[PDB]
Ligand binder design. Structure first.
Ligand SMILES: [Cu+2]
Ligand SMILES: [Cu+2]
Ligand SMILES: [Cu+2]
Ligand SMILES: [Cu+2]
Ligand SMILES: [Zn+2]
Ligand SMILES: [Zn+2]
Ligand SMILES: [Zn+2]
Ligand SMILES: [Zn+2]
Lengths: 153, 153, 153, 153
């Protein structure tokens, strides 16, 4: 009901993601601070299916998609539950923010506890690219950092 | 359900812990391979409460103990759910094995998903000792590597 | 803001439970009279998740737990919202009383309106058992009578 | 967002009515299967005010009418939100079907969750009789069965 993912990797990317959700029907509050990114950029931020890091961020699987839909924007009606959009980085490569979400949960059958958060190397096209991958991953590219979502105090 | 924990730290000890539990009622099988430990020895191996890695292995908290009991051996009646006793290390400092446990679950209110696995620097006295501390941690010592338990497959 | 549940089943147990709440912040007053129980006993009394009677009391599901907690006693910090403890039966098998509760609400997101009240065949251990079942239902046993919580006056 | 009422009483009439509403603005879908009616007939089908089964169906109160209108057909402008008109029974006295309604909701201040569904013993005159009662209940007579609308999943 309070969870955290410490992001780590081998590309200088690093950070912490905080989840808060008080009750089953309430929205989760996502708060992140990630550094080591490109400056002045937009980078893909998502929930991948597996909290598996056997071989690094590549071990995490595809996007969390309990409802079998297509990749989209956090604001679209048609998205994967793990679709958190893009995070915007500053002049120093720091992405900092917070938001609320109704699809992402800590409680119940679709819980994300035990899953992974990924920060991509590229930008998420929200599925409005003209490529077929756009509808899978949004073409956000590789995985500089990821972290398992764990239960905290 | 299949869960896994990738064990890391800054002391050169590392490894993989796999969990498997078919159904609620059923026992969880745990399998592991851990490297970098002292040779020919015994080291404490537990499940700690938090899957919090904001402060290395420290932030993992104490032993997961929903039944509010004291520390013991995996084969004791009185024990924490997290108590997996000691792993035996070989001539190369490797710990390799498997076991089935009935308290440790992947499904249910006592689920270990989102929690942490801990590989200690010392031997777990199995709550059979000198102190009061024995009754808390089995005096296993510091924590050279840990990992959040995540869902995989 | 006044609700009621008529408890019926195939076991000879029946009764009526009343709930009254004037504002979301105020505590909910629970009043009841239930007959046909064992005499001079303690039987489990809970709010289950669904107001679904398609399959007797079975279809009411588990305990109402929007906050993702373990089964406990009405007076513990950690408990399901629907944990109302045990009711005491007299010489005639009648259970009659009232109590105030601050987790149970008729107003808001965690309202119990439309959910089910279940009276059990056994005694609630209060989560003070050593099994996972204790942590799920207090080992209260079968469900002889239940009823949907409806609006009234 | 999903709910059900299980129709029962003492006259052989029984059944299930399902409701589904995705959001407050969307219309509600109603589906039903009712048995034990007279065959080849039309019977009044309404949502009554109280989900109170204390004394049986007579305890449900009058029609749900938060907007203080006069009784009518589901298609008129002036109707109680609880007016579902008549259900047509077949040769074996089974009424089956589905509809969509814009007054009836599962979400918000006029939610029907916790109120009663009633199947009458006679035909609803839809408010077009000359009598007074017509404007109240459409002269649908007694209540062979009713059930509280409860939450389901
Ligand atoms: Cu991604
Ligand atoms: Cu330990
Ligand atoms: Cu119960
Ligand atoms: Cu009516
Ligand atoms: Zn996606
Ligand atoms: Zn222990
Ligand atoms: Zn409970
Ligand atoms: Zn009417």
């Amino acid at each position: 009901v309070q969870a955290v993912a410490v992001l780590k990797g081998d590309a200088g990317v690093s950070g912490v993601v905080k989840f808060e959700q008080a009750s089953e029907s309430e929205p989760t509050t996502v708060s992140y601070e990630i550094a080591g990114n490109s400056p002045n950029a937009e980078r893909g931020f998502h929930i991948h299916e597996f909290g598996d890091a056997t071989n690094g961020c590549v071990s995490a699987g595809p996007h969390f998609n309990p409802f079998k839909k297509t990749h989209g924007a956090p604001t679209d009606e048609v998205r994967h539950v793990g679709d958190m959009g893009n995070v915007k980085t500053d002049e120093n490569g720091v992405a900092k923010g917070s938001f609320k979400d109704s699809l992402i949960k800590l409680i119940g059958p679709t819980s994300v506890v035990g899953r992974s958060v990924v920060i991509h190397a590229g930008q998420d096209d929200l599925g409005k690219g003209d490529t077929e991958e756009s509808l899978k991953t949004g073409n956000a590219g590789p995985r500089p950092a990821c972290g398992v979502i764990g239960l905290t105090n």
